Amino acid sequence: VLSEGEWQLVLHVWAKVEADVAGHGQDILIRLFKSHPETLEKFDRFKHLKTEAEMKASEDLKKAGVTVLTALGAILKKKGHHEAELKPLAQSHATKHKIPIKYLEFISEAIIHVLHSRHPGNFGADAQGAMNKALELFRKDIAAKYKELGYQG
Ligand code: HEM
């Protein structure tokens, strides 16, 4: 369970993301797909993209980035009270997309990498620790829902 002070470090860096969610989403998805190319195979719409240049030019990838960060933003703003937000996400990601918890770990690593690069003003050691705690809480609660839904993850 996070402290309020931990949540405030999460939400202070998220406010900087929100200056340009589309730009942050492009950097995070590109870092994910470069670090773990197997994750790109889950995306029928743009799994054909071969290069970072193609990824940066993809309007569909930019929309995916906005969607992921907006949904995660809504979850973080609940400060752990995210049961309602996680239900539909768990069901789609378990049953339709088939996203293992390992891949949620990979995108968490991508988010931390991009925030550390972009936001040294709001992403010092304490803030990164708070964000890791919030993302570990998210993955713990998703993993519990995957199990309820019948997915090994
Ligand atoms: C912070 C983690 C994540 C959040 C908040 C998130 C949220 C979403 C949302 C809101 C959607 C659209 C509605 C839906 O289908 O449920 C979506 C779609 C999807 N997500 Fe995620 N997601 C996350 C992580 C992942 C990861 C790591 C992958 C794959 C490696 C993944 C694969 C997909 C796919 C394949 C779609 C459908 C995209 C399409 O049809 O073009 N998601 N996700």
From Swiss-Prot:
GO molecular function: heme binding; metal ion binding; nitrite reductase activity; oxygen binding; oxygen carrier activity; peroxidase activity
EC numbers on record: 1.7.-.-, 1.11.1.-
Location of the protein in the cell: Cytoplasm, Sarcoplasm
GO BP, sorted A to Z: removal of superoxide radicals
Key words of the record: Cytoplasm, Heme, Iron, Metal-binding, Muscle protein, Oxidoreductase, Oxygen transport, Phosphoprotein, Transport
GO CC entries: extracellular exosome; sarcoplasm
Modification type Phosphothreonine: residues: 67
Phosphoserine, modified sites: 3
Transmembrane segments: none
Domain Globin: 1-147
Positions annotated to bind O2: 64
Transmembrane helix found in the keyword field: no
Top-rank EC class of the record's enzyme: oxidoreductase
UniProt KW Oxidoreductase keyword: yes
Reaction catalysed by this enzyme: Fe(III)-heme b-[protein] + nitric oxide + H2O = Fe(II)-heme b-[protein] + nitrite + 2 H(+); H2O2 + AH2 = A + 2 H2O
Binding locations of nitrite: 64
Residues reported in the UniProt entry to bind heme b: 93
Pfam name, any one: Globin
Entry-linked InterPro entries: Globin, Globin-like_sf, Myoglobin
PANTHER family: MYOGLOBIN (PTHR47132:SF1)
Function: Monomeric heme protein which primary function is to store oxygen and facilitate its diffusion within muscle tissues. Reversibly binds oxygen through a pentacoordinated heme iron and enables its timely and efficient release as needed during periods of heightened demand. Depending on the oxidative conditions of tissues and cells, and in addition to its ability to bind oxygen, it also has a nitrite reductase activity whereby it regulates the production of bioactive nitric oxide.
Assembly and interaction partners: Monomeric.
Protein name: Myoglobin
Organism whose genome encodes this protein: Physeter macrocephalus (Sperm whale)
Top-level taxonomy: Eukaryota, Metazoa, Chordata, Craniata, Vertebrata
